[PDB]
Amino acid sequence: GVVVDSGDGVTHICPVYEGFSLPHLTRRLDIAGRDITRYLIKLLLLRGYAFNHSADFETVRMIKEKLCYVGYNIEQEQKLALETTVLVESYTLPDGRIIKVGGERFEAPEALFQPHLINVEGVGVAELLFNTIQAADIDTRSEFYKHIVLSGGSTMYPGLPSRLERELKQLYLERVLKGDVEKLSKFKIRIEDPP
């Protein structure tokens, strides 16, 4: 299976066959922990809160860690942020001031799925996994897709697994099924979330 390990350092999609790993297939993504904390900062600014990059990082890490999550259907996560107040949660800063967080809860992690949002070139963890697996002997495929294990502090975002399973189910229906809907029902992807 493939260990999609991502922490405060960097993202890695390292495949593993029967024995050990196959380095020729393991890839990297330039979007880890620190990279999502910042995009949050730069996101809380456009909202009315100016935190000092080199002095509030630690305080914004916790904010992310505490209220950040992976949206599933971004088009629907937007109507919730714009059309209603259900995503808005309060958060007390160390000095006592009480701020708010909303859309920027799911937007900050969305970088993993759209690197450009933080001006970085790639295709984003999901569209990266799909490629790392098609780049393997078709007869070693079924295994991988059936076995994708998430590890690393940056993989615990609420809804992360359900997104991948949707991203992949998307990349498949198009780039491996050429858009034939009547056969997606056969695509089985098991992304486990080992505690």
Partner: protein, 341 residues
Amino acid sequence: AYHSFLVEPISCHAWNKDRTQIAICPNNHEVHIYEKSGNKWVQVHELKEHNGQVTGIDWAPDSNRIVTCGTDRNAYVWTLKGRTWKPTLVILRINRAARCVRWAPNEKKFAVGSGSRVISICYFEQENDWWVCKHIKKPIRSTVLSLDWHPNSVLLAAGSCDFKCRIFSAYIKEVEERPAPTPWGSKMPFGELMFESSSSCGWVHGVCFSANGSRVAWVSHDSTVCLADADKKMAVATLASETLPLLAVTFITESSLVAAGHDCFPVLFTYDSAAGKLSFGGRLDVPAGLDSLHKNSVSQISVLSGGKAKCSQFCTTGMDGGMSIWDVRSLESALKDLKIV
């Protein structure tokens, strides 16, 4: 007899054998165990391990083990190691939130309805020294709200968001012996679908098995109460309520049902097996801004003493943070016209 443990809802509760302690989830990610000292309640335990909101608790009387299901998709079995409780992770193999749990009468296994649209059945294998589970999947097309084992630790009632009340078989041969015939049927292989209500309305908030297990009743969101008699060809009797939906139900005798819910007060229904016809027995909570004991919706009701056969004391809890305790006899003396069974 009301007592408030808090103003936030009580998620679920589960008393021990003696009824000397009560375990509750204070809308929290944990379970609080209260013991009684005199006429004062006193928290004695804090079960912390879940990483999500606890959705169900069940206490195994004789073995004295607690089982809890969270939204973190996990389930833990709590064992009292002398002074404090240690949990043990039980992998239910699901991808959504656990929604409710129940230990089987034999305490050899527990069920776990869930969002993955599948019930889970777990048992311990002293061979490898850990729990394991098999899933009852079809024909479950939605989230599973409530569960209630049959006295024989094999049949299982289930109410789900797809509008159906169903009886299954959780027959796990690896821990119990072949099941004996039941009016529900003689064919009882694992996951077998014995019964299924025929309604397309209301979600099934709660399901209950009779004392002798040949009668099952459930409450739907269409403000109806239902009872299916296994000794009448599984013929189902239905009562169209005139108030808000009930979320909980239990038998207090073989022909008596007590259900609480969004009207915040417990009521009584009586099944007349003769005509296979349910009927409204009246309100049992009789006299913020409410004239009911509980202030918010009552969401769980259990039998405290006298089993479902001849219940003497039952208890209810709701979203108002309050836990009540009723006396079936006292209520009969307060209402002349209260005709139980």
